[PDB]
Amino acid sequence: EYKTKVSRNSNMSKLQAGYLFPEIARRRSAHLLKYPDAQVISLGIGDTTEPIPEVITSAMAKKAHELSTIEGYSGYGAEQGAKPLRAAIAKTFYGGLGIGDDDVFVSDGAKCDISRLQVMFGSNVTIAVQDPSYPAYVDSSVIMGQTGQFNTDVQKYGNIEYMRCTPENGFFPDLSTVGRTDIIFFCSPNNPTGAAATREQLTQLVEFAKKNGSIIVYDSAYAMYMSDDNPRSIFEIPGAEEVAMETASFSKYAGFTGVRLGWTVIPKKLLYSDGFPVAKDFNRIICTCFNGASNISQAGALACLTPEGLEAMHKVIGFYKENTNIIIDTFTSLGYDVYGGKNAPYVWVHFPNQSSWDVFAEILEKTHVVTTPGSGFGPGGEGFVRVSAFGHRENILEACRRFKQLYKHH
Amino acid sequence: EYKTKVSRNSNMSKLQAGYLFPEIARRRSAHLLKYPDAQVISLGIGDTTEPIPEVITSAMAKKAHELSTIEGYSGYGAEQGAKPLRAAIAKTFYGGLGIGDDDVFVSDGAKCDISRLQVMFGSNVTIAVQDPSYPAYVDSSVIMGQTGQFNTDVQKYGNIEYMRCTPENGFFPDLSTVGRTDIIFFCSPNNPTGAAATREQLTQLVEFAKKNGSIIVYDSAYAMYMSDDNPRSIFEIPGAEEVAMETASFSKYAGFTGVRLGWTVIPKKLLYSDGFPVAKDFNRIICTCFNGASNISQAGALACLTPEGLEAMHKVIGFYKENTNIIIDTFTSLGYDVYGGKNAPYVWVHFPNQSSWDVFAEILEKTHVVTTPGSGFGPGGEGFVRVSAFGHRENILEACRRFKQLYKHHH
């Protein structure tokens, strides 16, 4: 066979396996081949299941109709997003925190912003991540050339600072033990653990970044699931504007997982070591590497940020939070150490003395319920399984009765 | 003031100025501050202006409505795109060319695919580009670390092979003089010259890539504007499947510039030097760095690829092609050397002995019409101005009457 003379990107060669979530989808497919008549329930991939509120879909259909009229048609938008949407996001989520409309960058979702940030930072930065955390932070770091090879002894890529988050430290890094890096990816409420950092912990985080001269990339994708009285934005911490940016999404708020709309906030006072503002480089990336979020998606997001939209999102979130309660009560009743599930739609269940991939396979095999193994989120996730609360109510209730059946003699 | 100790990305520092198009938007905005009541006509940024056909928007509205129902709701889609959409693209544009549904990757547009392909290729590849060409190829290359610094004597970034495309060579480079690179970005019909490569020229291109072991990234964004009997896809050339991928978009076909939907095709027979299939690496990039095109945009794209959708797109394209003739006739009547506008919605006008930035500035100041300076597309664009044909008919006519009034007593 003919082959080109182009070398494969050696950073792609570093990746130890495929992306976690497509692999979960594939195991579930293999399970259906083995058990063709199984009624599979997915509590694995964190994918919204309830319809989008009518107030929000109406706005999107209205925008679609407008695009077929002379007066309503619009072509390219500013890559940073429509000014009224940037203004609505700035006021609704960061009002009083010193964020202007021009600090807000509208994206087609937080996953894409993470990779665009990584392009901006480039191959020469070192990163820290929570261990465990959402696998896109690590995988994007490897792809950008920020890492060494994968070490199978410790299940870690070289040159990444994995900050262990455990029951024994309250799922917050012991920062006095964390080495200095350029970037710190920090998700709160955390995926997979569900842990939301307190005001005091986030204060420690900002102070740590300030003394180390690091940039925090704060992922607030689940902030609106907060029940405890903890900050929802890193910008609630005085000083955060000198060291932090924030990335968020409508995915888990309005069910926009397939619609695609998020944003990133980069404050004016965030500067590189030579004094150059980080936001100006991000702006170059988004003007060169992106052509803006869909105009229909932006219209839907604008409708979210109204009294009626906010009420609708609250009801959606509240529904998934009640699912979470059902799951937590189930595992606690079965005698498990169960974590998260208070400030997040994920429950983090401790399966000590077992490998999480084995627990995943056992649950799927015996109950036909898909979960997510903790080790897919890094080596600190080993011994845990993440259970997602996104599902129809009857599906959650049925999943929990299957768990009860399975685990009654444990 | 506090600064972090994080070093700025040295690839970002390399960039000579801002991205071209926002700079044009800024000039337009500054002009409107100077003259708030100017009736500005924009023929600069190539942006569609006519409404999206009803058959297509009705489909998008239907999908939006379905998302509010238990049965119609869907969440995350496969990052590669809905299977029926991939199949529709594969059959409609590549039927008979040996492209499968699994070779097609649906994106939120061609600009975004260019940068995801560049992440995939990485910093260790060298590239060739047409000179002039759409500036995203060069700028994404600089961002990814594939280049040296900007040389202001020649107006080029180091380590990029700029392939000279001129009136004299028929806007196709002399491949005997082009150095070997890993990647060759090739746009046909080309932006900004409007030049469409012939079957003979694309055959030379494929043979050149095969002998050099290069990958062609073929941008066919304007292929449906073709009037001459030239290939619309690189895969029409036998052997392309071993050396080429293709990127395209609904932006200029259905007016989806704001809606956001395109695709990339990477064939099974495209392999790196170690035998590894390029498509498998692209698939990892799109699964890691992307979460799929909008479900509503995909529903719109699906409705485009039906008899009614194709008819509607053909009609819109034909409208913009008539605009292009009006613009060509205007500049040829004023005595300019004028290129393009046959196979593309751009007219490429030679202004000898003047900088294109100065011509841009003069046209905007005197006529309140926005154009694009050719030097924004690379050094081979110096001395030319690009004029876009996208616009309401009355605006195109009015712009041309302003050009004639400005230039008739001098030219």
Ligand SMILES: Cc1ncc(COP(=O)(O)O)c(CN[C@@H](CCC[C@H](N)C(=O)O)C(=O)O)c1O
């Ligand atoms: C901490 C965090 N940050 C960002 C995201 C992505 O947000 P986005 O929808 O791109 O605006 C998510 C959603 N992750 C879920 C869905 C995963 C499967 C999806 N295909 C993906 O690759 O994100 C999960 O962990 O099961 C997240 O949890």
Ligand SMILES: Cc1ncc(COP(=O)(O)O)c(CN[C@@H](CCC[C@H](N)C(=O)O)C(=O)O)c1O
């Ligand atoms: C040769 C070629 N390839 C790809 C594209 C982008 O396609 P996409 O809409 O992302 O699917 C274009 C559109 N470029 C236009 C609009 C520019 C301004 C837009 N903000 C941008 O940055 O593309 C122009 O040259 O004036 C193109 O010409």
